[PDB]
Design a protein around this nucleic acid. Structure first.
Ligand SMILES: *[PH](O)(O)OCCCOc1cccc2c(OCCCOP(=O)(O)OCCCOc3cccc4c(O)cccc34)cccc12
Ligand SMILES: *C[C@@](*)(O)[C@H](CCCNC(N)=[NH2+])NC(=O)[C@@H]1CCCN1C(=O)[C@H](N)Cc1ccccc1
Ligand SMILES: [K+]
Ligand code: NA
Lengths: 27, 249
DNA sequence: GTTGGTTG
DNA sequence: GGTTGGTGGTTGG
């Protein structure tokens, strides 16, 4: 139930350089 | 990966590398789904047409890696397979249908900054996110051209509608497979290649900010060719088999 | 059915 | 140092 949250990313409120491309595609 | 870029540290902490023992060689990508279970493409382990048969003894699973070649001290963990589980209806003869396999590890892994499980989709997660035009993310250590990168590569590609998939190849498509990649007139490109098989095609849920594995790198014709699109095992369509096998063993 | 010949 | 301790190593520079 901890799956899919990255310790160095989501778990720390930081974003990787490209994940914005993914979310943006959903428009 | 073709036309991708270096993964940042811990950007894909479920990424797994399938390592042949003798000779020491990188075979394939895989992915971590629990502390005990790893997911990969069937063809990685079994492909008679190229004389490919690997079982438990032949293989190592390396987890938490970033550097392709170098051992990573106190970052990467190494497990041995207790039991492989190819999907019974895996069609190595014609079209790599149900190109999927599970592997239970002998010792469960400790999670860390670099090793962390991905989520597998449910009905609606699949339904909403798996759609023509939505981009996903492919990672792996495979070939940079129709290769040998030093560090885990990454690329994001748009899911493509069936008609375009089917009309791109004379190989018979099924609904256990989807295709992804930029069309010829889109200026952006990129693809998985030979070596990336078993690696996940992941999507971030805008609903709960979680990563779901929608796909497994399966096949394609060359790499990064205008008019051609890489193909991925449809992970959800095979979700029941996955749960089935986990429950039992 | 770990399952709708490529396999026993 | 590093994604990690103390001349390579389960390993490059
Ligand atoms: P690629 O193309 O970068 O090739 C590698 C070349 C760089 O080599 C090294 C860079 C950094 C560190 C080391 C190294 O470190 C282990 C010991 C840590 O330091 P120390 O306290 O043991 O060293 C004492 C001081 C020695 O410093 C130098 C010695 C010789 C030359 C130079 C120099 O030109 C600039 C600065 C310092 C020194 C071990 C081996 C290689 C490298
Ligand atoms: C095993 C994996 O490393 C690799 C991934 C290829 C990714 N392709 C692209 N460009 N998206 N898969 C393969 O090499 C597969 C397994 C066997 C051969 N193969 C192919 O992709 C063939 N080129 C095409 C093919 C042959 C037989 C049946 C279906 C497809
Ligand atoms: K070192
Ligand atoms: Na293409």
């Amino acid at each position: 139930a901890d799956c899919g949250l990255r310790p160095l990313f989501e778990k720390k409120s930081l974003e990787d350089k490209t994940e914005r491309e993914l979310l943006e595609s959903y428009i | 990966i073709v036309e991708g870029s270096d993964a940042e540290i811990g950007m894909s902490p479920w990424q797994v590398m399938l390592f042949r023992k003798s000779p020491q060689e990188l075979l394939c990508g895989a992915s971590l789904i629990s502390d005990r279970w790893v997911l990969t493409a069937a063809h990685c382990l079994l492909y008679p047409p190229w004389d490919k048969n690997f079982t438990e003894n032949d293989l190592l699973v390396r987890i938490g890696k970033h550097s392709r070649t170098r051992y990573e001290r106190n970052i990467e963990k190494i497990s041995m397979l207790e039991k492989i589980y190819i999907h019974p209806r895996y069609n190595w003869r014609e079209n790599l249908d149900r190109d999927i396999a599970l592997m239970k590890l002998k010792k469960p892994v400790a999670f860390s900054d670099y090793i962390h499980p991905v989520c597998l989709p449910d009905r609606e997660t699949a339904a909403s996110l798996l759609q023509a035009g939505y981009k996903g993310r492919v990672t792996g250590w495979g070939n940079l051209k129709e290769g040998q990168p030093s560090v885990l590569q990454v690329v994001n590609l748009p899911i493509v509608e069936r008609p375009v998939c089917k009309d791109s190849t004379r190989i018979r498509i099924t609904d256990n497979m989807f295709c992804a990649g930029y069309k010829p007139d889109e200026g952006k490109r990129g693809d998985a290649c030979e070596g990336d098989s078993g690696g996940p095609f992941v999507m971030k849920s805008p609903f709960n900010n979680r990563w779901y594995q929608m796909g497994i790198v399966s096949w394609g014709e060359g790499c990064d060719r205008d008019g051609k699109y890489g193909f991925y095992t449809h992970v959800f369509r095979l979700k029941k088999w996955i749960q089935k096998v986990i429950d039992q063993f």
